[PDB]
Each structure stands twice: as C-alpha cells, then as structure tokens.
Amino acid sequence: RWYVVQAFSGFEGRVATSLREHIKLHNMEDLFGEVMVPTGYVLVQMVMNDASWHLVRSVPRVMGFIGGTSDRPAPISDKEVDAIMNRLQQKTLFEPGEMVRVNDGPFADFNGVVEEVDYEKSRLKVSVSIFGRATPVELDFSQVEKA
Amino acid sequence: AVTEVEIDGVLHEYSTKEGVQEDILEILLNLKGLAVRVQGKDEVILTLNKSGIGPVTAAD
Amino acid sequence: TPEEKLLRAIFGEKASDVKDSSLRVPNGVSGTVIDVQVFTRDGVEKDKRA
C-alpha cells in the first residue's frame, strides 16, 4: 500500500527524511519499506496502523496525510457517488443551519452548510470546506442538495 | 447497373432496419447483381413501394 | 476595459473574447461515421445528443 504524506514546499524533502529520522527513534522493524521523494506531495509506502501517525502529530504543522480521510489514507471515491446515493434518499426546503451538499461548479465533490437562504434571488450561499477552513459561495437549489 | 439510391427510413449505411433480416451492406450487393434493360430514355428514377408479410421478388 | 464591452458582439458569445480548440480528424485518415456514444460526468449538464 501507498499513502501520500502532504508536506510543505521548501521543507517538503525535509519531511521525507524527518520521516526516516523519527523512524529510528520510535524504532522496531517493518512499516516503512521504501520512502519515495517524488517532488507539496510526498508519497510514502505504509500499511495502516496507529504508529507513525502519533509521530506526525508530535511534529507538525504544515500538512498531514492525503487520500480521502486524514486518519486513514488513501481511498479514491469522494462525493459524486455520494450525490448518486442522495437521489434515492430524496428537498428544496433550505433554512439557516442545515447541511446543503454541493455538486456543481468547482465546488463539486465537496459538501457544505448553507449560510444565507435567499428566496427572492433563488440562491443558497453554501459554505464549502477547503484548506482546513471555509469558503462561502452562492449555489442554486439544484447546484446543491439537502443532506 | 445500380448507382445511387435513397432509402426511406435510413440516410447512412452501417445500420439495421426494424423488421428485416438482411443488413444494408448485404442489400447493397444484392442490388449490384440485379439486371436492367433500358430502351427509351437515358437516366430514370424509380420506386420500390412494398408492404406486408412476404418475400421481396423483383417485379413489384 | 471598454474594449471588452467592445468585444462582446464580434464574438457575440460567452462572457469574454475567448475560444480555441480540443482535438480534430487526423490529416490523411478519411472515413464514415456510424454510431456515436456520449459519457458526460454526473453533476454537470449534457448536450442535445447525449
């Protein structure tokens, strides 16, 4: 298996050796076979576990793991297949504080909470989560779905 | 011999008709081997008006 | 600038004066179309033919 360790350009290589530096301190055997330095993206060979994750959380904070979720790398199916499953589940009833799943524009493959519900303008200011933060953007009743 | 033909229901070859066994590419060749005699004019346009359960002869 | 409000009707289409290409028929190769098939991503809209 291969897990993509996201690191920061300039010290991105530094992270790849800082893997191998801290590997010897927490040492036993196995886990890390062949550390690849391809370059914000450092591809690292690993089987899933609790070890080495604690190490990353002990020495941050620029970037973490890549794939689908940060705890457990690395899947491939994001949110469009989730947008197909929402069709069987189904509302145009949107209010402040309800989850409003986006699937149109550059905000596709991403979810969000609606901030502003306009009935006159026919828009939903849906806040999409990007870069460990938020992005509030107006997307139509159709450009989104109720979660 | 046969040269130019306009299908009623088909524009381009490489397709399959609704309710016929023989494909167009097959039928193209069936038309090639057909024999014609002309006395009166030079070039003529003719029509094959046919319908029903039955085998396509040649006269009709 | 003004020039963009003065470019939106020579190219009376899109929001801006921008259009290029994708891919084409190769030079030398010549043939006939039979049946075309369309695969557009679920999320964004399709054409008349799709």
What's the resolution in A? Answer: 7.0
Is residue A110 within 8 Å of A101, Cβ to Cβ? no
Total Cβ atoms within 10 A of residue C19: 8
Token duo for residue C40:
């557009």
- Cα gap A112→A144, rounded to integer Å: 9
Does C29 touch chain B if contact means CB atoms closer than 8 Å?
A: no
Residues in A closer than 8 angstroms to C42, CB to CB, are 80, 83-84
Peptide bond between residue B35 and the one before it cis (omega within 30 degrees of 0): no
* CA–CA separation, C21 and C48 (whole Å): 20
Give the end-to-end CA distance of chain A in Å, rounded to a whole number.
33
Which architecture does CATH list for A1-90? 2-Layer Sandwich (3.30)
Helix (H, G, I), strand (E, B) or coil at C3: helix
> Rounded CA gap, A86 and A101, in Å?
9
- Chain B hits for C32, CB-CB cut-off 8 Å, are 12-14
Query: What is the signed CA dihedral for A29, A31, A36, A37, rounded to 10 degrees?
Result: -80
Question: DSSP of A74-118, one letter per residue?
Answer: -----SHHHHHHHHHH------TT-BEEE-SGGGTT--EEEEEEE
- Method for this entry: X-ray
With tokens 């159709």, the residue in question is A142
C3 Cβ under 8 Å from any chain A Cβ = no
End-to-end CA distance of chain B: 18
Q: Do chains A and C touch (3 or more CB pairs under 8 A)?
A: yes
- Helical residues (DSSP H) of chain A, grouped into ranges: 12-26, 53-58, 80-89
- Looking at the complex, report in whole angstroms how far the Cα of residue C47 sits from the nearest Cα belonging to chain B: 22
Euclidean distance between CA atoms A95 and A27, whole angstroms: 52
Cα–Cα nearest to A5, from A33, A43, A39: A43
Cβ atoms of A3 and A73 closer than 8 Å: yes
Q: What is the DSSP letter of A126?
A: E
Distance of CA B37 to the CA centre of its chain: 16
Q: How many angstroms from the chain centroid is the CA of residue B23?
A: 12
Report the alpha-carbon distance of residue A110 to residue A68 in Å, rounded. 12
- Chain-centre distance for alpha carbon A131: 8
CA distances from B5 to B10, B24, B46, B47, C32 (A): 11, 12, 10, 10, 17
Query: Looking at beta carbons, which residues of chain B come within 8 Å of C36?
Result: none
Q: Which residues contact C12 (CB under 8 A, 6 or more apart)?
A: none
Alpha helices in chain C (DSSP H): 2-5
Structure tokens that stand for A135 in this block: 């992005």
C33 close to B (CB below 8 A)? yes
CB-CB neighbors (< 8 A) of C43 in chain A: 80, 83, 103-104, 108
Tell me how far apart the alpha carbons of residues A116 and C45 are, in angstroms, rounded to a whole number: 25
Residue length, chain C? 50
The answer to whether A137 contacts chain C (CB < 8 Å) is no
* A103 CB-near residues (< 8 Å, 6+ apart): A79, A80, A83, A109, A143, A144, A145, C43
Neighbours of A117 (CB within 10 A): 16
